[PDB]
Amino acid sequence: RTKIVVKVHMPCGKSRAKAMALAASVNGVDSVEITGEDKDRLVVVGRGIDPVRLVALLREKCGLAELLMVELV
Amino acid sequence: RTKIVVKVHMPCGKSRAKAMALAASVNGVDSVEITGEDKDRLVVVGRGIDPVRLVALLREKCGLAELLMVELV
Secondary structure: OEEEEEEEOOOOHHHHHHHHHHHHOOOOEEEEEEEOOOOOEEEEEEOOOOHHHHHHHHHHHHOOEEEEEEEEO | OEEEEEEEOOOOHHHHHHHHHHHHOOOOEEEEEEEOOOOOEEEEEEOOOOHHHHHHHHHHHHOOEEEEEEEEO
């Protein structure tokens, strides 16, 4: 089990939904959540997730994204 | 804040990802999670989510779905 936290440019509900649905569509994801005071942290938990590829998809579709944490759960 | 639990026909990783991404795409959703021993419970948390419409979208795209719980968080 792996937990990944990505800071994402997502300044409205529509853009939060686009990013959440992108992360949720990666095979092996069990959980996706938006957190933080600014609602700009995407938290993804699953098995067999490549963090580098996930951040690259989010950067491509949301414009800006940065990997903040990877952690075994 | 509202938490919704839907039992969904999702017997593989690909079909779990399709259902998760469908729930995540609804505006106002903050969290989506797959739970249960059989990995067949979709847990959705957010604001302003219509549970009846959510279950109807999941039924249409995954084949079978049933609302199990709605709860204020």
